[PDB]
Design a binder for these strands. Structure first.
Lengths: 52, 52, 89
RNA sequence: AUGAACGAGGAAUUCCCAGUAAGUGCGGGUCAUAAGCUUGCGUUGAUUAAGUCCCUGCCCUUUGUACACCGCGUCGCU
RNA sequence: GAAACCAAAGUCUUUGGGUUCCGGGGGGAGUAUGGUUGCAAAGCUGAAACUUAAAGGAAUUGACGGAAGGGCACCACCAGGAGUGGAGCCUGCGGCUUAAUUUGACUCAACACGGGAAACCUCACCCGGCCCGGACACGGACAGGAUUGACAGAUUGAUAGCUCUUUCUCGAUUCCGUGGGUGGUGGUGCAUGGCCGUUCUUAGUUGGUGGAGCGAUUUGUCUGGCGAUAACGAACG
């Protein structure tokens, strides 16, 4: 509905949700390093969005 | 600072091509800033790339 | 008739008066005649005196030659910004 | 009386090399009534460096330099 | 000599030793046609129609390098200091409402700036009311009045004659139109001046004389890591 996804820093997640987000970020970093063969080099709280 | 992100509503292409990419209903258009002299420090991640 | 400019374009601006030097096109419903043809223009001055006004030749006969009447509306700009104006009347 | 947030502050960023920052008040301007602003003045008063082009800009110098070519089309009548 | 350059490309307007070939702005075009040679491909000779105001030659600088070096500066950095950004709040900005929440200003070169800490004034903005402070000249009206000011009541926020009633004042000091002057914190700072800010608190700017070149131009305004040194002097900063 023309509303962009909020950033990870601005998202108020619970402890389990924060752990799941950290695990997803680690898995994404591993997939980028291994499968995509690229380093983001600008990964931070403002470069990650939480959606669904 | 370097690019502007705009949310927009995409159109439905009436061309019935088998290889036509599906246009999403909501799209983000990123337009990089070309009139700002603050991009002098970005050469470190471009000159090191063998593809360009 | 209706007087128009004798140019090469499609549209012809209507002339609301007869000019003393410009060569115009008089356009009217008339019996069809094949060009060339000498054309004379007269008017009753007074007591049945036919006065000559204008003369020429007959151009091609067609109803597709449209005549355009124009009206220009004037306005006095009383406020001026850079490339922006506020106009009244 | 009321007593809140505020537990030294992410990304990011400003000014500053000695009676200097910073702390501290005072006076002038404003001003009928008036300073959190501003312009000045004294008081207390240090750590770091005697450098560099790493960032941002700016500045010069020398070397040459007065849109070249090869890779937009088919049909239709008067 | 146009110069690059050339002891010939010299002895050329101070033009004449002998002789051969050959060029006449650029394209069309070394094309078509014809002749001739050739096994052939081709060669030799070789137009025109039409088309354009340039095509070209030497030398001189450099706008610009997507060319490389230095050098400068706590409005850049290192070593740090004290901070802002995080709290409450004061004041300027926008967005939003409001009748108005006037306005100028938007990177450093706008944002506690407009000396702008505005209860009235300021004040331009909103609502309401009052006055002419229409100078001047012309025409008309006007002394048997052109007018001005005003008690009381109605109205009014207003001891606002602002309008009416009530009729009391005033002696051309005028009034109505015509031209036409003033008055504006009204609009253009992208029409101006002045002043200010900025580039830039940079490190440059311009002249004169001498020498090279026909000239554009060059040397000066300087190669080097003492020494070369056609250059020398000024002025502003």
């Amino acid at each position: 509905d023309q509303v962009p996804a909020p950033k990870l820093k601005e998202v108020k997640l619970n402890s389990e949700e924060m752990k799941e987000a950290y695990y997803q970020t680690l898995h994404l970093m591993r997939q980028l390093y291994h499968e995509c063969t690229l380093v983001h080099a600008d990964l931070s709280e403002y470069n990650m969005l939480w959606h669904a | 600072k370097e690019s502007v992100v705009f949310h927009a509503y995409g159109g439905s292409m009436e061309d019935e091509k088998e290889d036509s990419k599906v246009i999403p209903t909501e799209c983000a258009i990123k337009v990089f800033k070309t009139t700002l002299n603050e991009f002098k420090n970005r050469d470190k991640y471009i000159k090191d790339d063998f593809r360009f | 008739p209706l007087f128009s400019q004798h140019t090469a374009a499609d549209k012809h601006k209507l002339q609301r008066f007869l000019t003393a030097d410009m060569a115009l096109v008089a356009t009217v419903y008339a019996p069809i005649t094949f060009p060339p043809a000498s054309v004379l223009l007269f008017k009753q001055k007074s007591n049945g005196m036919h006065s000559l006004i204008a003369t020429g030749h007959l151009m091609s006969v067609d109803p597709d030659r449209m005549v355009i009447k124009r009206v220009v509306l004037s306005g006095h700009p009383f406020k001026i910004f850079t490339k922006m104006a506020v106009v009244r009347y």
